[PDB]
Model the fold of this input.
Amino acid sequence: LTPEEKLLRAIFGEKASDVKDTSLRVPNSVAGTVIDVQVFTRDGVEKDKR
Amino acid sequence: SVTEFLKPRLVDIEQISTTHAKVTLEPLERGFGHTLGNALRRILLSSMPGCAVTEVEIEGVLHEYSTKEGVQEDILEILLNLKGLAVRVAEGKDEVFITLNKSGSGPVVAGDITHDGDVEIVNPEHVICHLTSDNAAIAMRIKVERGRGYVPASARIHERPIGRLLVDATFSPVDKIAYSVEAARVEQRTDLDKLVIDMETNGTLEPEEAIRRAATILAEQLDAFVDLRDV
Amino acid sequence: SVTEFLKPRLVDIEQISTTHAKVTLEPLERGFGHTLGNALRRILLSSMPGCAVTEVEIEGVLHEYSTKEGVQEDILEILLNLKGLAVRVAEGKDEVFITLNKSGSGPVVAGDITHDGDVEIVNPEHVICHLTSDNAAIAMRIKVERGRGYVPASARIIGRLLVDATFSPVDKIAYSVEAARVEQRTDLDKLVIDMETNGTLEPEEAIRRAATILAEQLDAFV
Amino acid sequence: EREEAVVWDILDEVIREHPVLLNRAPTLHRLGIQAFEPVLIEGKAIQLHP
Amino acid sequence: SIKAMLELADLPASGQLTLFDGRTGDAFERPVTVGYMYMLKLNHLVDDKM
Amino acid sequence: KPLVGTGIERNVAVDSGVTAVAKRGGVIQSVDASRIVVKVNEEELIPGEAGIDIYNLTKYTRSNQNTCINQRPCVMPGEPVARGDVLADGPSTDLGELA
Amino acid sequence: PSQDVVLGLYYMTREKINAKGEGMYLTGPAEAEKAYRTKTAELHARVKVR
Amino acid sequence: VQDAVEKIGNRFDLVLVAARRARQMQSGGKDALVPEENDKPTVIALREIEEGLITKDVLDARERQEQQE
Done:
C-alpha cells in the first residue's frame, strides 16, 4: 500500500481484500437472454446447489 | 372570389370492410387536393395513436426461446402472432390486462380472450396458437398499452420478474394510405376538385376520427407559422 | 400523451434584405419538416392571392412577334419586363388600367406610369424599355388584375398582347430539413426556409398568410 | 460507464472542433488518410462523404 | 413467358410502374422498375465489426 | 421461400440433413414443437416392431458461427406421410425448400 | 463528382423538343425554378432566360 | 485555411506558430485577441493569424518583453 493509502485506511478503517473479483460478465454492447447454464465439476469436488 | 377559398367538408365515408375505408372531402380548389392529400397521408402514416400488446406472461415459461408441451408453435412464434392482435381500448385507459385460458386440441384464436368489457377485439379469427393434444392447456396474461409509433422492447427505459416477456409494439393502426384527386361537380364551376382517401387499417381506428386527428395535428403545427415570431 | 407533439421552440428570422429572409424552426417531429415545407411551398407558389400585369396594348403593334421602330427591346422582351412589375391594387378592385406614355431617348422605366391613386408601384426604377430615337414615342395601356399563383400566357390562350401573370408575390422559396436533437432524441427535424418576395409583401407576412390559408382549409375537421 | 446525459453533452463539447483521422487500407497514396470534423451520429457505422 | 405472367396478373408488360415521392407526393418523371427480389442478410454485421 | 427459384432448393434442404425426413411412411400420431410421433403403415413394419417412429427436434442450438439451429414442425396430427416427406424444417428451410 | 450526381446533372441539363413551356421568356433562374415547381415548364424546355 | 497560409506563406510554419499560440492560450494564462465564439485554442490561433495579429516575430517580441520584465 502506498503511504497515502495507509493514511486513508487509518482515517476510514475498511479493509477487505482477501479475494479479488474475477467474474464472468456479459461483454459490452451485448444484451440477451440466458437460455442454458451447464456446470461441469471435477470428479472429487463438491457439487454446489445449482 | 379570389381572396376567399372554399373549405372542404366530409361528404362521404364508405366502409368497404372492417379494415378498409374511403373518405371523400369536397370541395377543394386547384392544387389544394394534392397539398391536403400529401399532408394527411404523411400525418396518418406516422402519428396515429393506437393500442398494442407490450407484455405477455405464460405459465411455466421463462423465455421466448423454449417450447411448451402440446403447443405446436414456439413461444417466439406465439409472441409474433400476438403482435398482430387488433385491440380497441376504451377512452381513459392507457393500460389493460386481458387473459387467455384454453385447454384441448384446436386453434387458440383471439376470440378466446377474456376481457372486462373495456376492451374490444376486432379480429376474433386471428390465430394465436395451436394445441395439438387433449391434455394440452395454455394460460397467458397479456398487457395492452396505448401509444403512438413503434416502440421496440430494447428502447423501453429500464424490477422485472423472470417470465414476463416484452413484445415490440407497433401502436399505429394505419397500414396503407392512398389518395386521389378527381373532378367535382359543384354548382357551375369546373375548377373544384374532390379528394378521396383510401385507408387500410387494422380496424381499431375509425376513418372520420383519423381524418380529424390528422387535421388537428396539422393545424397545431401550423400555428407556429401563423404566429411567426422570434422565440 | 398520444396527442402531445413537439412544437417549435427556437424560431430564428434572419433578414438579408427587405425582400429576402431565412426562417429556421427547430425542433420538429420526424417527417414534419418536409410536410410543412412542401405544403407552404405549394401554397405560396400556386395559390397565394396577389395583383399582377396580365394584358397590354401598344400603339402600332398587333402581334407579339411584330417589330416596333425606335425601341431597342423587342416586343417579347417588353412583355418580359412588364412581368416583373411589383404592383399593389387597393382592396375592392379586381381590375385596373394604367397607362405609360413617353417620348424621347433613354430608359423608359416603371416610375413613368400614371394611375388613378388605387395603384402603387413598389419598384419605380424597373426598366420597361429603351427608346433609341428622339422621334420615337411609346404608348402602352397596361391591365392589372387580381389572381392566385403563376398563370402563364399559354394557359390563357384584337391587338392585345398577353403577359405571364405573376400574381403571387413570392419570387423564390426553398426549404431544407436538417437534423435536430432534444435530449437524446437525435431524429428530430429542423426546417430552414429561404424566401424572397417581389417587394409587395415581407417574407414573414407571406409565410403567415400561407399558413393561415392552410389552417382555414382544415376548419371543418378540427 | 453509466452513460449519463451530461456525459453526452461533455462529449459534444469535446468533439466540437477536434479533427479526427480516417484511413482505409491499402493506403496507396497520402489521400488514403484524411482529417475530418466529426459529427456524432446514432449508429455503429462511419458516415463518409461521397 | 415473363410478359405473359405479368399480363395474367394485370400488371404492366414492361415491369415499370409510376411511383410518387412520399416526401412531396409528386410523380417521378419516368416509370420505375418495381418488383420483388430475394435478398439475404450476410454474416457481416456492424455489431461484430465496430 | 424464394418466389423465383431454380428447382434445386428441395435437394439442398433434404440432402443437407437439417430437416426431419420420414424414415417410414404412416400417419402422424402426435405433433409438438419438440417431438413428432409417426404411426407407421402396416406394410412397412419389421415383424415384431413397436410400430412408431419418434423424431426429437433440435431447438435453439448454437451453430459454429454463433447462429441459431432450430427445427419447426410442418405437419398436423392425423396427416398422412410417406417416406422421404419433410416433417420438420431446419434453419433456412420452408416446407422442405431452401429459404 | 461521379455516378448519381453526374447522372442528375446530366438529366437536368438535357434538351427536349416540344417540351411543356417551350419558347417561354424567363426573368432569371429563380423564375425558371418557379415555373418548374408550378408544372408550367419541364426541366428540358427550351426557353430564353435573362 | 487559405487566408492563414497567405498571411504566413508556409503551411508548416503556420502550424508551428499556431501551436505556440494555442499553447499560450491553453497552458499559459494568455487571453485571446479576438472574440472566442466558443472555439478551441487551435481555431482561435488560426483566426488570430488570419487577422494578422499573431506572427512569429510578434511572438518572439512578446517573449522578449516578458523576459525583460
Q: What stands out?
A: Chains E and H do not touch (no CB pair under 8 Å). The radius of gyration of chain E is 17 Å. Strands of chain E lie at 16-17, 32-33.
